[PDB]
Amino acid sequence: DVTPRRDAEYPPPELLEALKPLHDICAKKTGVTDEAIIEFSDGKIHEDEKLKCYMNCLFHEAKVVDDNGDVHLEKLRDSLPNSMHDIAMHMGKRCLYPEGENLCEKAFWLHKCWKQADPKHYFLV
Template sequence: MNYAIFFFLVAILSNASGMDDDMQELINNLHNTCVGEVGVDEALITKAQNGDFAEDEKLMCYSKCLLDQMAIVDENGIVDPEAAVAVLPADMQAEAGPAVRKCSKLRGSSPCSNVFEVMKCWYTESPATYFLP
């Protein structure tokens, strides 16, 4: 799933207009795995893709599941900012890196909410590089 990390972190692919079929399949598999695991409402994901983050435990755990699948978060929901930045293409690291590093310091009240706080911050700090499959 390491290729999925790239797409997760690069918001310009959120419209999927230039994504090849193999990469779209990886994104779909990641999404389907996590939806199946946590049972999140698809409508909440759609809203979160546009910055409307409902304080919903399943949505929070969906976010954690995504990063778990990408191996950039630990069991406590602590995001490894260097792992996240390292998978970005070089031309995106300068733009997304500061937001990823800043936001990865945030904490919630549980492993799922830790990731959720990071995701909300990332959207606020760098909406052009944010993507939630």
């Protein structure tokens, strides 16, 4: 029911400009297409095997995992500022249980979980 939102008030225009590129990087790496990426953000949650890899590709890119993609939760927190940190703790009220078989499937679990958690603060990632 709730519709996605994002402007120059919640999402910082600075980290936003740095995201697009970072996104273009992993994307071009996963071979995926903005369409798939967008459809996932503006559209709805689709199951594009690539989008899943594109996500996993992000984890590694941002270098926030160990040596296999275990996604260090301790490092993930120390990464985002106290702002996203608080919003990250709120969403945690739904995920925290990667159900897949590999980084790709897992990376997706969280996203699909971080999206259904509260469809209003989610944007590109």
